[PDB]
Amino acid sequence: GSARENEMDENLEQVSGIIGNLRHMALDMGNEIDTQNRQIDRIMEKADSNKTRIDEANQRATKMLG
């Protein structure tokens, strides 16, 4: 009738398995955030360049209106 220690051991085994899955997700999460952070940096440089081009183009266009 020893079920207490039995369930306890089973629960711990289940927990250990899940922690393995949490490690799995944590590693993927980290790799993905690193990759996206680099992409966001690329995007930010491109956004800055485009804002400059648009600002310059509107100024140039403005000079030929009116």
């Binding site: 306890m8 711990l12 927990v15 899940i18 899955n21 993905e32 990759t35 996206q36 491109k46 485009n50």
Partner: protein, 79 residues
Amino acid sequence: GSMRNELEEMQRRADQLADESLESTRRMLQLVEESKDAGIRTLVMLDEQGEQLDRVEEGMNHINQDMKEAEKNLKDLGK
């Protein structure tokens, strides 16, 4: 003997500790299951967001290309 009361307290303590350990492992399962759900949601969102960022970068590339052309035309118009 008089120690019977003490011995019963000891048994109750052993049972209490064992039970508390069991209850803790049950709480652990609830915690890791919720953690797993959170991790799953996080990966689902990161996947979606990564596709959005790819489209944003493509958009930045498109704007860059078009603005090079616009600048050429504006300079052509100016002189």
